[model samples]
Target: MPRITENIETYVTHLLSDLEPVPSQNQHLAYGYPGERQVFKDPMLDGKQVVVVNSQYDKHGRPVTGQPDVIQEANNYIDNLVAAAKSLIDKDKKGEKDLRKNAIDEMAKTFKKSISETIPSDKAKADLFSSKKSSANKDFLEQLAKVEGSLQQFTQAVAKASGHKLKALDKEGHNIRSHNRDTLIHRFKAPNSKEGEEQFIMYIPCGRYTKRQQRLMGKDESEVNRDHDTTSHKRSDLVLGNSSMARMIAGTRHSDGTVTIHHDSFSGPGARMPYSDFKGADDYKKLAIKAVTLINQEEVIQTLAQRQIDRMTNEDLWNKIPEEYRPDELPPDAEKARAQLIKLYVEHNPLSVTECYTQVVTAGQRVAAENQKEQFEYVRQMMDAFDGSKAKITIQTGSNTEVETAVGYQARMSSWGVNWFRQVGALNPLSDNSVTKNQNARFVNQMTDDVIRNLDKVAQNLGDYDKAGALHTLLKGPDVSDLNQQITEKENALKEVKGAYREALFSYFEEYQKGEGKWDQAKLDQLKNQVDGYEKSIKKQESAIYELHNQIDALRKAYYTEHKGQINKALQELKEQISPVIQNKETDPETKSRLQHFYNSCAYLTQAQELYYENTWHHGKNNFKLQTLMASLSCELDYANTKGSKSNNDRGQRLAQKIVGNALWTAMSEDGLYTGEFLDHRRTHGKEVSNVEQLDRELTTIQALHHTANTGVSGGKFEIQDKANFADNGLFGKVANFAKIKE
Candidate 1:
């Protein structure tokens, strides 16, 4: 079983201690090892600490899924650390050089293409490439050559930048600079040499004089320093030039006190620092040469590093360069604009989060959950072996974190920052629900208030010619009693007609004698004549209304279209007048005087226009609905009368029956008759009552007048359509009245 590291405060402290504080504005070079660095602020953090933790999981033999063996787990952890270290080292070695080479090549191609475009023909281009007769022509050639050379050098610089070795081939020769090897230690050994015991030493040149020097020296010198001294005289002339010269060189003295030189051409050393060497002397020599070359290439490395540092320091590095590079601030309303844009993005991309989450996290979580379940089963088996009873173990995990991460990513995928690279053909939706269209509507309302406030200031400077004159006329000028009196009389006539129609319905019911018999011809004619009078009155009212409505529409269209420019001018003038008054000091007398003329002008003009719109456009909107309803009701009433033609009794009966059924059915449906408890209870009761007997009651009727309303003959039973008669009548009448029209 894996042991849980509970309350691992020390681990966090250790991690912190291990982290190196990178210098501000300085790029710290990492030693090829797994560790941490804290330096630059990540903008995404918004002033909080940005923590980045990364690890790898290696698949190794333990149990296929469940709790890994302790030793295997440790090995896995170590392997991950090593892998991370290697990755960092590789990235460091490649990053700068690769970026530099790519940039230089891209620039070179652009420069070449531009030059090619300027030339009319291929011959001129070729001539530009290789000719030096004219100075200007020569200069162009030189420039082209310089660009090509820069491309090459830039490529090398990039390699050096990444702390990697460079290789190049030119007409002179082929040159190769090898990278330095990492100096991380895997193991250590004692200096003493024994059988199977490691002999440790640092490499240095072979040379020496005494026993004291040999003891302090590394293993290479100790092994052969004594041998070399005794045999030195024999090889002195061959290896060290001359015995006297060698002594002079070693002692740092000359016979003439000027100088004595001795050359040691074949001096080679094995281990000389503080570690065991690789396999052989040849290997050591190869390593030494490579290390020396790498050290010599430090200049190039420094140049690359400085370039990176400079690039990082540039604030506009991330911004794209347009053709004409002119600096400009973002729009004053940029934030508001961005918010509107965000809303549009979200409206289209609802499922993006779920899809992204499944891609990033769900697969991993599913595997983890499944593995845990399997492990629990194994643990149960193991428990039985130890205690003869199965262990009841459960492992639970939630996908909430995964869901949240997916949602967050979806929200940002189409943000202004990321949307620059969005695909063209399909729309990418925003994941943020808060920035939806409904929210934008609310924002628009607030913006409207802002607009109104600005408009109020503008209104102060508008001219008051028409508005003030109208107001004055209304208060103290002409008599308009005639118009009011005419309107009153028309309204009274309409009310009287409506009252007569209501009375006619009740009178018909009384004459029908409990609504079971038909009406007499004489009485029916009287009622019909009264209805005709009411219908005529409604037509006269309608004609008057039509004239009034047409006049209002004509006045509105003419005034609005023609006076729009004047209204706009007044608004502008008023704005200027009131802005200073509201924004400047209230105590300033000059400001008040400056505003007075324009303020009065604005008030008068604004009031006139508002009153005009109120009486015209405002009433027109309401009157339109009323007029439409009236037209619809008039059509229905006409339909009713046509179907009730005096000569077509059968057709009238069918029409009435159809109308009643439709009206009552609609009413019942609206009231939810099927769902009513009384109806349901009756259905149940009826089923039971069918099994029981019931008595039928005897009835007798005394006939009154037997005649059709107009025919004066036996009308038979006046089948009054259905129980839905009142419903039909109510709907038809209400429609007609609401429409304010005559049929």
Candidate 2:
């Protein structure tokens, strides 16, 4: 795109017009301009407004109408100014040049500022996106830790408060009693059983009790309630006529006081609750057996703790692995197994505050404390091995690392507890070096010769032979006789054409300039110099023509001048024009004018001939240069083609393979540290062509580099030794060595 900078204010103003100003009373006063009074002439100039508005239009037109019209009017005015400036530029070449240069500079500055500020921020945002997974993990870990802490506290508190016990009967017993009293209090406390009353209350009979109280109890009323009743004077009252003394009668009353004939309540035998019932000491020992059931719950907690420990350990270790080593591919079953384990662990102990806290303090501490460092190191090694293997696998498979793509084989391995290292070792095996080298050579030799041969063939065909012959004839033509005579004739013709064009253009600009009878001083001077230069060039051409004519004249003077009438006549006519015109100064004014006109016409024709000659010469010269260039280029292409064809024939395939093989070895020797580095070197140093012969030189140099890098026992062993040395150093060494081997 071309830069644009002239009329910056006009350009910005149009964009500004698209914006609506914030409405306010102050804005209204500031924006309202050119109306009622001249207090506000320009809205943009006012402190309260960002944009200008025509105060006259706002006041005279219907209220709130034509608001955008004022903005549009301002834009139109700027547009007109821009158009005028553009028109001025189009009419004046010098002005256009000056304006273009200035505009380009201003636009460059604007572009620099805009690109620096806008593009970098977006680039930075893109860079930030690459670390999204790490950020999420950090955030999740922190939140999950807090939740775990809360769950632990809540769980511990509940356990302590409840005394770790709950009974089904407790709820039923409470329902029958008052809110504050326990119906099972008799189980804990003994009742009085003396003076025909029991000191200890066990279970009272309920047969004598009212139906209402019996219905509210959990068991049949007879099990919990007992009563006694006493009565007297019943016999004496029945026999009023008899004087015999009546004996007193007494009866035990029902446990309920509602049976009101001197009744009394009594205690009964108690029935033991299911859980507390024990027949003997041995029976009581069975409680120990019940305690064993708690082991299942403990095991559940332990299992959850172990899982969480593993997860946390793995998370921590994942950080220790370098980013480059992170796997690009996953094992087939890895994701599935990972998901299953995650589900199982989470289901048993969901990530609640209470659960996390309990696990942290109780189960987590116990398990984590046993081998904290060892476990952490174990996970770290696993992660490192996995990452290394993954890197190796990705390199081997040529996998893409885009997030949407799964780390296929590595992910599957991770699920199996196999780790990436195992998978990599399994997948990669040593390639047959002999077969590889042969294949490499075969491909290189086949392609290289074909390309080189084609290039040579192209060089032999397709050239500008016509242009070459024309140039040769022009440069080495026969010398002409009487050069001065021919120069005079051409000069006279040049004047005629010059006079006609001058008169026409002069008349046009003169009328446009309102009777100013001259062209632009600069343009006129420039045109005069160009015409003079053409005259000088034609003088040289005529000199050549004269020499050739002179040669013919010399030959004709001896014999051909008499015998060859056609040649002699042509020479005589050419010689006749060399004489200068002579005239009477005052009496022959018309003849002088006509002579001047003829001279101008002659001058014009001479100029035209010179132009045509120059153009034709340039065309020939250009064609020759083009042909030479094409020849050179074709030779290079032919070389490339021949090299391609003989890829298998001229050891072309072998050489190409040698080049690629050399690069691959170089890469491998460097542990594959820099991608495309060797290929780039090959492009820069091996196949480049500048001149026709340079192609052969390049090919030779490439073959030499390949041979020097790969042929010698010492050179070949250098890469292998380096890898061995790396392996001896550590796991990273082993990993880097493997990469080299694979490459």
Candidate 3:
């Protein structure tokens, strides 16, 4: 359970007062602990104390004011005060009995004392006696009066421990003689009444003055009203019912001195009276003040101030001061003064708030434009650098060289050509040291150009967006509705052409059958030529439609790559535009360093491209060599003891052995033993072998045999056996026999 202090103001004030520095007389500083010479001659010199000192200094060697440490200390003080006040209130609320009684007394005392403290003693007395009756003076008097009255009511309720309840009469206007003992009456002359007239107000309880009780006792109304009602009413009303008393009297005395008593009545809607009304109200008011103060603290105030600044126009913030607040006569430098005032109001320096905001907005626009420019320039450079004519080759024949422009010939010389050569068994023409550099340059440029052309329409669409100031066009993507319609139309046209071609062929056949004997050879040849031309037309139309579809598909893929998360355009541009520049040794050190950052940022893109190239070009060649090695090993194992083997197994084994062994021998002779060494080592000692377990075992065996032949007796014994004759003896015999020579 938590206790809440109704007198939080008292707690906060006490804590704040306690935190104030205690006044101390000047003291001298001793050298060490004691019994040492005083540092200062003056007795007023104060000794050093543990106080927060400003570490930041100004140009003139003075400590800077409003340092971060000092500001933080001030904030901590306020926070601690709030926390202390809250803790006290929480403690008070959780107590067994309410602490509101003590709280109310303290609040009233503090409130009056605070008000008195606000005014100087002499001035308060002078103002009290002076007759300067203004609205301010009248308001002060009225507020004081209200405070006093509420405080009195609160104290009276607490002391009396009684409350009020009232009721109205039913048989009104009937006169009855009443003898009342317990009643208190206050008589006063009415404002407009005759000289001797007066108003008599009486307080009585409805419970004790009931006519029904009198009736139950079998007494006449007059007797009951005279006897029991009077005594019971005094005790119940004057003592217990005092809390229900109202100031507004209901009855009046007539001018002739006749009194007409009207029943005092309570109205509709019962309201509960809390035990500590004054303390509760004061607590709420204090909490509200604290809340408002907290809201006006630095962080919250700054947020609200920024929001207001955003809502105000430049002119409004600058010149919208009220006329009354401005001076009637302007100085010559009034414009400058107003400008300075506006600057101070908006907490800005020389630049207007509007200018600062505009600068930020414009900076974003400029950055976006720069990004677009970079991308466009990268693509443009790639396209310009491409030399498509390199695909054509010059072959020497006799004395003169003939230029061949065949597509296959050109493709074979391209990067794709090199890839195909490596995938199969052909040597790469570009593998020559001198030619390799030129070939790589040509291949990269051509590939980049082809990619750019494929995505030209997408780039154009993006450019249109850039011109229109739509920077996020990549997110919106291209509209392919028209392309889809065109593709459908092309397909329909191709279908019509094919149908026409078919009809012509059928018509020719029908005519030939109908006029078998009478048909002219020249006419028949003419019809046959017409059908062949239609078929050729159909094929041409189909190819045109296919190319259109390819273009449409390429555009779609580019669009998705731009809009989807599959590719990051910025990183891709960085890699394409900067990687090549950095890789070139011709670039200066400074330029290379600058480009290196770009390369580092998009290193993943470079790695992905390298992986793709490696897999596409080298993976096939690697697998082929690996499979051959496995085949050779399997064959060697089977042929090792082929003397008693059947024809099918022996022949198959011999064929596999010859083919694999011949290929390895040729490769070794051409490119050295390192060609098959990697595959052999990988199969023998690597963690992951080929998926084929038997092939893996066979390759490992072959690797062992190869190592033995190279390291053992003589290397010549390891050569393939063209004829099955174990000519050598001892170690050589064993090796030759294991190799399984053929006759």
Ranking by TM-score: 3, 1, 2
lDDT of each: 0.24, 0.22, 0.27
Q: If both were scored by TM-score, which would come out higher, candidate 1 or candidate 3? A: 3
Q: For candidate 2, lDDT tens digit of each residue in 1-743?
A: 00111121221222223333343333221111123111211222213122221212123221221111121122222222222233333444353455443553353344334333433221121111112245543343343333334323432332233232113112212122111110000100001111332111111111121222123222353322211110010111111100100111111112331111111111110100111212232421222112211111121222222222232322343444455654564336533333333333333332310010000001012222322222222222222122111110000000111011112111000010001111122224421112112211222222222233332343234232233222222222223325434534653554444333233322332222321265465654454444345535544553454344444434423432233343323323322331133223353545433333222222222222222223321131121111111111222222101111100111122223222222222222212111222222222211222221111121221221111111100001111111111111111111111111110
Best by lDDT: 3
TM-score of 2: 0.13
Q: Write the per-residue lDDT of candidate 1 for residues 533-585, one digit (tens) a residue.
A: 66466656745843443343444435555655666564544454455444556
Give the lowest summed-lDDT range of ten residues in model 3: 354-363
Error of 3 at 705 (Å): 31
Q: Write one digit per residue (lDDT tens) for candidate 3, span 1-743.
A: 00111122221122211122322233211011111111222111122111111122246432222111111211222222222233333444345223533453354455445444543322221111112254544444344344334333433432222111111110000001012111222233322334655433332211121232233334565432212211101211111111111111123355643444321211100001111112334432322222211211111112112223323333454465554555464445533443333434333321111000000000111222322221222212211111121111111111111112211101111111111222333354322222122323333322333333333434444231232112123323356447546655764565445445434543454344334487676766766777557656654664564455455545644555444453344444544554455456786877554333222212322222333333432353332332222222222211111100011112112222223333322222221111233233332222233322112221111211111111111111222221111111111222222112111
What TM-score does each of the candidates earn? 0.16, 0.13, 0.16
Give me the overall lDDT of model 2: 0.22
lDDT value for candidate 1?
0.24
When summed lDDT is taken over every stretch of 10 residues in candidate 1, the lowest stretch is 695-704
